[PDB]
Amino acid sequence: XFXXYX
Ligand SMILES: *[C@@H]1O[C@H](CO)[C@@H](O)[C@H](O)[C@H]1O[C@H]1C[C@H]([NH3+])[C@@H](O)[C@H](C)O1
Ligand SMILES: *[C@H]1O[C@H](CO)[C@@H](O)[C@H](O)[C@@H]1O
Ligand SMILES: *[C@H]1C[C@H](N)[C@@H](OC)[C@H](C)O1
């Protein structure tokens, strides 16, 4: 449920 991009 978060996103990113790391
Ligand atoms: C991430 O969210 C964006 C904005 O809502 C979408 O436009 C994008 O298509 C999404 O990224 C894709 C590819 C990604 N690797 C995957 O984890 C997500 C679910 O869908
Ligand atoms: C990727 O990892 C970073 C570092 O722990 C988090 O901040 C992020 O929420 C995701 O898990
Ligand atoms: C999300 C966008 C970001 N610029 C990328 O780093 C190379 C990451 C892997 O995906």
Q: One-letter amino acid identity for 5? A: Y
Residue 2 Cβ < 6 Å to ligand 3: no
Distance between first and last Cα of the chain: 14
Query: Which residue do the tokens 């790391």 mark?
Result: 6
Q: Is 3 left (phi over 0), alpha (psi -120 to 50) or beta?
A: left
Whole-number Å distance between alpha carbons of 3 and 1: 7
Nearest CA to ligand 2 atom 5: 6
Report CA Rg, the chain: 5
Residue 6 Cβ < 6 Å to ligand 2: yes
Q: What is the resolution of this structure in A?
A: 0.9
